Amino acid sequence: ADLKAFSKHIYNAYLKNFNMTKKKARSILTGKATAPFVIHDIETLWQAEKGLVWGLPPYKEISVHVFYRCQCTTVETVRELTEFAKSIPSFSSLFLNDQVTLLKYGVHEAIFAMLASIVNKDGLLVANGSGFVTREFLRSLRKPFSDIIEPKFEFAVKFNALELDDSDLALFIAAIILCGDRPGLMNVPRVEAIQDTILRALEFHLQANHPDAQYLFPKLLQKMADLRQLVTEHAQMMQRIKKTETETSLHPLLQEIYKDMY
Amino acid sequence: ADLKAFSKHIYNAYLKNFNMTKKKARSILTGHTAPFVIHDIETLWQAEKGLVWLPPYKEISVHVFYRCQCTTVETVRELTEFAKSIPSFSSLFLNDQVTLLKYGVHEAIFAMLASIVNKDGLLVANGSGFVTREFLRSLRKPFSDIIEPKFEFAVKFNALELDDSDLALFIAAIILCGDRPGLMNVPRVEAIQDTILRALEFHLQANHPDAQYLFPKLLQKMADLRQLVTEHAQMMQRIKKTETETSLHPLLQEIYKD
Ligand SMILES: Cc1cc(SCc2[se]c(-c3ccc(C(F)(F)F)cc3)nc2C)ccc1OCC(=O)O
Ligand SMILES: Cc1cc(SCc2[se]c(-c3ccc(C(F)(F)F)cc3)nc2C)ccc1OCC(=O)O
Ligand SMILES: CCCCCCO[C@@H]1O[C@H](CO)[C@@H](O)[C@H](O)[C@H]1O
Ligand SMILES: CCCCCCO[C@@H]1O[C@H](CO)[C@@H](O)[C@H](O)[C@H]1O
Ligand SMILES: [Cl-]
Ligand SMILES: [Cl-]
Ligand SMILES: [K+]
């Protein structure tokens, strides 16, 4: 494969399928020419919900409302990641069951990697950039809901230090989805071969795009391992919430993702 | 009238994605170049040598079994693309798409098989071969027994004289089935199926104005196909149990996983 044309193709599929790019997010977070409405307590969340910014279950309390907002966010991103993946060369050539296995075990890894794009150390963009929810407000939620969000900030701030751009991330995300190690995958050799092409494209891309960045490719391989561990811990927290907070609901798609994880 | 447009869209998906139409098949089966007739070991070998066209060759009945599997896998590819070319199907989450295909493809395969079948045999290799029903009956058990019920279904199904535009809606209705195990968005699939069934109802009145009771007859055929697949799966289970030297294609393993 022509690696340069391959990478540009995945870059364009990324721009076509993800509305909020890191480029757009960073210009908002630094104030380039409407600023985001800051959500930092109940009153501003309520205002944001009325129209300042923005279906869900009936409002019971702040921590559960945020928990449901998190689920709606991730379900939307699963839709975008599905369309993105279908544009990766030879992903659509897999039988549909292997496509589902790759997305099932990969979407959260990709979500938490892309989450870093819309995050700084003080909070995250919500609602296509029109809101900003502060990290301190999220810490103020009652357990178990506060504990599940903070590790993602921790990962994101370290990941953002690598200073990837959208062209890097498009290959990185593709590599996460095209993973031959997923449980129950049918055509492992084919998935392994696609991933190798993506990784060779990524290594080549980084030489060109980050010439002075030392050890960047192996650092990104380690971040992929780090994300797998982040997702394992996240899945375990979600299952504990499902067990102890019997009155809170889990979106059916997320139940299907978390079904056979442990 | 929106149903008419909806039907035309499903018909185009069918014309775009299936390798063989019933119109094409029936013209071949009624006679440039006729299909090569496979009716015994010698003619099957000639067909494999290039006259028409897998795991290492063990014996005739198992060889045919493997060709059945290859044919099925190919049709799963086509049915996947057909369903993806239906917008309301492609809007479901991918897991529901897989559930519908997992539990629907064999029903659809056996319905479409009728298109390439007459009482004497069936077309193979994109119509360039014809394998006789008598030859398939001559294979050893368990391989002869699993094929014959499909001829019996097909001859009765072909007496309804559906054309490709009818079949496109019929197959869409089979795939968009709200009753499949593990389906996530059941009400959405149910809504799509009811739209397909209403479009089919109107299509049959337009296309078969004189055919009395044709729509309920097709609903019954859908029920019959579910039973045919139940019996087929039981026979495949017995082959997995008793023919330990015969392999099963990985995709079919996933379909039959249970
Ligand atoms: C419980 C849970 C936590 C996380 S942590 C990363 C976060 Se925080 C967040 C958010 C926060 C506040 C608001 C609001 F203030 F506006 F309400 C909106 C959005 N979005 C993401 C992606 C990810 C998934 C998840 O559950 C869904 C799943 O497992 O798929
Ligand atoms: C074992 C089995 C039987 C059937 S019966 C309907 C038939 Se017959 C046939 C065929 C016959 C002869 C030849 C050759 F003589 F030319 F070699 C080629 C093709 N194809 C189909 C679809 C369907 C599935 C199945 O197993 C696969 C599964 O269950 O998925
Ligand atoms: C498009 C036709 C695919 C038919 C085989 C589906 O097979 C299914 O794939 C799922 C993974 O997607 C598995 O969870 C499930 O156990 C398996 O039976
Ligand atoms: C595209 C994202 C799909 C994530 C949910 C996958 O969910 C899976 O769907 C399969 C049916 O296809 C089931 O066999 C399996 O049990 C379920 O875990
Ligand atoms: Cl940061
Ligand atoms: Cl089945
Ligand atoms: K017939």
Numbering used by the authors:
A (entry chain B): 173 to 205, 208 to 228, 234 to 441
B (entry chain A): 173 to 203, 207 to 228, 235 to 439
How is this structure described in the published paper?
Among them, the PPARδ agonist 5a containing selenazole core showed excellent agonistic effect and selectivity for PPARδ. Our synthesized PPARδ agonist 5a exhibited sub-nanomolar potency (EC50 = 0.7 nM) and excellent selectivity for hPPARδ (>14,000-fold selectivity over hPPARα and hPPARγ), demonstrating similar efficacy and better selectivity compared to GW501516 (EC50 = 1.2 nM and 250-fold selectivity over hPPARα; 1,000-fold selectivity over hPPARγ). To clearly understand the binding mode of 5a in the ligand-binding site, we determined the crystal structure of the ligand-binding domain (LBD) in the complex 5a-hPPARδ (171-441). Compound 5a binds in the ligand-binding pocket in a similar manner to GW501516 39. The acetic acid moiety forms hydrogen bonds with the side chains of H287, H413, and Y437; corresponding bond lengths are 2.8, 2.7, and 2.6 Å, respectively. A pi-sulfur interaction with a bond length of 3.9 Å was observed between the selenazole ring in 5a and the C249 side chain. Hydrophobic interactions with side chains of residues L433, T253, F246, L294, V312, and R248 stabilize the complex receptor-5a. The trifluoromethyl group in 5a establishes a weak hydrogen bond (2.9 Å) with the side chain of W228. This interaction was not observed in the co-crystal structure of the complex GW501516-hPPARδ, which showed a different rotameric conformation of the W228 indole group 39. The increased potency of 5a compared to that of GW501516 for hPPARδ is likely attributable to its additional contacts with the W228 indole ring through a hydrogen bond involving C(sp3)-F-H-C (sp2).
